[PDB]
């Protein structure tokens, strides 16, 4: 039950997620989950990053959900819920630009 989640922003655009994440106050790993704009039934994990090369910037990762039940970004690493996916990526960066740290204000 994902809508209950404070990091779940629902139906907002890619541009809007970037407006929110590009705030100078945001540390690396600030994030939110939103609906994909054009992939039905898919979500998008939008995450802030920072480096001296690019400065503050944003990356988007597609989250797939199977009818069979699993949620994932990479099929090799699946979760029983979106909440568990978020908790896992708050500990492991794996292939993300940064581990998830703080919910986007
Ligand atoms: O789902 P798409 O529409 O292809 C798109 C997207 C691209 C990359 C990751 C997640 C979603 P966005 O939602 O338009 O940013």
């Amino acid at each position: 039950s994902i809508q209950a989640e404070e990091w779940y922003f629902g139906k907002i655009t890619r541009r809007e997620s970037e407006r929110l994440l590009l705030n100078a106050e945001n540390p690396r790993g600030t994030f939110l989950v939103r609906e994909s704009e054009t992939t039905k039934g898919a979500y998008c994990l939008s995450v802030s990053d920072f480096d001296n090369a690019k400065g503050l910037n944003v990356k988007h990762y597609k989250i797939r959900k199977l009818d069979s039940g699993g949620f994932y970004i990479t099929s090799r690493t699946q979760f029983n819920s979106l909440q568990q996916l978020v908790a896992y990526y708050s500990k492991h960066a794996d292939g993300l630009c940064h581990r998830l740290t703080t919910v986007c204000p």
Side-chain angles (χ1 to χ4, degrees), residues 9 20-21 25-26 30-31 102-105:
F9 285 50
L20 287 165
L21 289 165
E25 296 187 348
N26 294 333
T30 298
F31 76 96
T102 152
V103 178
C104 195

Side-chain angles (χ1 to χ4, degrees), residues 64-82:
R64 318 279 254 84
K65 178 217 191 144
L66 303 167
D67 288 307
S68 340
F71 291 81
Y72 62 85
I73 292 174
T74 174
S75 68
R76 304 307 314 155
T77 308
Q78 308 194 188
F79 305 87
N80 293 332
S81 65
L82 195 49

Side-chain angles (χ1 to χ4, degrees), residues 12-15 17-18 34-40 42-46 59-63:
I12 62 160
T13 62
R14 167 179 284 222
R15 181 161 174 99
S17 71
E18 295 172 345
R34 61 178 171 84
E35 290 181 353
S36 154
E37 292 187 2
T38 66
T39 314
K40 78 287 136 266
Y43 302 97
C44 171
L45 171 59
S46 296
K59 289 285 186 200
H60 305 284
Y61 305 96
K62 193 164 289 173
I63 296 174

Side-chain angles (χ1 to χ4, degrees), residues 26 33 50 52 57 65-66 88 93-95 100:
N26 294 333
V33 174
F50 179 80
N52 298 333
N57 63 104
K65 178 217 191 144
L66 303 167
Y88 174 95
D94 286 3
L100 309 177

